[PDB]
Amino acid sequence: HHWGYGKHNGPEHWHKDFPIAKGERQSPVDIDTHTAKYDPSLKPLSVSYDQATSLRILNNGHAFNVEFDDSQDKAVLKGGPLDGTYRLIQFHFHWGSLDGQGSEHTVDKKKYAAELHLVHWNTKYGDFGKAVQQPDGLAVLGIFLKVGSAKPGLQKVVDVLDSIKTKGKSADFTNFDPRGLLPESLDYWTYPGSLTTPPLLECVTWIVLKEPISVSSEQVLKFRKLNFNGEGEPEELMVDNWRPAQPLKNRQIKASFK
Ligand SMILES: NS(=O)(=O)c1ccc2c(c1)S(=O)(=O)NC2=O
Ligand SMILES: [Zn+2]
């Protein structure tokens, strides 16, 4: 009886195995744009993905991850609310069964069709494993996806999904450039939070971009063909793999723009 997104193992059940689910800095959260405040202390955000080297794509039964080689300082995120350098290790998405839902964070309660998470770990901790034991160990760059024109840069990901349909399947995925998934503007909201799936660790500095990228109905439809189940098992379409907004509690969301 593993955690998941269904009626009997979904988000409302996670707290039993992971009590931190009811913690003080859980994610995602609704971003109230009127309550968010411009923060002058935020430094310019730097997203340097020029030397990023992707390696493989994997269906882990919850979503699909595009993993990168993070043994050298290559694809890094810095600036903004961050102290130091954070290294890109993987990116994945959360999406819905319909275009009207799918994102984890919401903006004034608005849900987007999907949300892209580019996960980075703080290099001061030596490796990802040590980073997830720290309160400032991770930084996740979140980008909303809305349905409209296709995103050319996402098609290569869309086309390889047929090869990793079920849980446990992976495929070589080299030379993918994540710069093709970024919107024009880097304006963002930031707050301290957690991983949005078990183990729900509170080690994340969230940086959520205000400008969403547009993807086509056809591209998101292909996300919905993936399976939560493993090969040979009853088919459970991989849809609505998102966690709803959690209590903001004692936190303030800061904006990088006026
Ligand atoms: N959805 S997310 O908060 O980016 C996230 C959720 C789970 C995990 C991550 C990110 S991780 O740091 O790559 N390892 C995980 O288990
Ligand atoms: Zn995620």
* Total Cβ atoms within 10 A of residue 22: 12
The two three-digit tokens of residue 44, written as one number:
């310019």
Alpha carbon of 242 to those of 23, 40, 106, 197: distances in Å? 18, 32, 11, 9
62 is an active site residue: yes
From the list 1, 13, 15, 62, the catalytic residue is 62
Q: Which residues contact 97 (CB under 8 A, 6 or more apart)?
A: 224, 237, 239, 240
Q: How far is 154 from 92, CA to CA, in rounded Å?
A: 12
Q: How far is 8 from 224, CA to CA, in rounded Å?
A: 21
- Vertex 76 angle, CA 124 and 147, to 5°: 135
Tell me the resolution in Å: 1.8
Phi and psi at 33, nearest 5°, equal -65, -25
**What is the three-class DSSP state of 62?**
coil
Report all structural domains of the chain as residue ranges with CATH numbers, in order of start: 1-258 (3.10.200.10)
Closest CA to 26 of 242, 240, 249: 249
The two three-digit tokens of residue 211, written as one number:
């400008």
Find where tokens 């949300």 sit. Answer: 115
Our answer on whether the CB atom of 143 is closer than 6 Å to any ligand 1 atom is: no
- Vertex 75 angle, CA 74 and 77, to 5°: 125
Find where tokens 């591209």 sit. Answer: 219
Phi and psi at 107, nearest 5°, equal -120, 110
First to last CA, the chain: 47
Q: Which ligand is nearest to the CA of 58?
A: 1
Minimum-distance ligand 1 atom for the alpha carbon of 194: 3
Do β-strands 37-38 and 254-255 pair in parallel, antiparallel, or remain unpaired? Answer: parallel
Exposed / middle / buried, residue 204 (Cβ in 10 Å: 0-12, 13-18, 19+): buried
Closest CA to 190 of 140, 144, 145, 146: 140
Q: Cα(250) to centroid of ligand 1, in Å?
A: 23
Phi and psi at 20, nearest 5°, equal -65, -5
Our answer on whether the CB atom of 90 is closer than 6 Å to any ligand 1 atom is: yes
Q: How far is 23 from 42, CA to CA, in rounded Å?
A: 26
Our answer on whether the CB atom of 158 is closer than 6 Å to any ligand 1 atom is: no
Q: Which residues contact 207 (CB under 8 A, 6 or more apart)?
A: 45, 77, 80, 81, 82, 139, 140, 141, 142, 188, 189, 190
Our answer on whether the CB atom of 105 is closer than 6 Å to any ligand 1 atom is: no
C-beta of residue 183 within 8 angstroms of C-beta of residue 143: yes
Q: What is the CA radius of gyration of the chain?
A: 17
Q: Which residues place a Cβ less than 5 A from the ion ligand 2? A: 117
Longest dimension (CA), the chain: 54
Q: Cα(59) to centroid of ligand 2, in Å?
A: 13
Query: 3-state SS of the chain: helix, strand, coil percent to 5?
Result: 15, 30, 55
**What is the three-class DSSP state of 98?**
coil
Minimum-distance ligand 1 atom for the alpha carbon of 121: 12
Elucidated via: X-ray
Q: How far is 50 from 178, CA to CA, in rounded Å?
A: 9
Nearest protein CA to atom 8 of ligand 1, as residue: 195
Read off the amino acid at residue 149.
Answer: S
**What is the three-class DSSP state of 30?**
strand
Our answer on whether the CB atom of 246 is closer than 6 Å to any ligand 1 atom is: no
Q: Which residues contact 189 (CB under 8 A, 6 or more apart)?
A: 31, 33, 36, 207, 208, 210, 253, 254, 255, 256
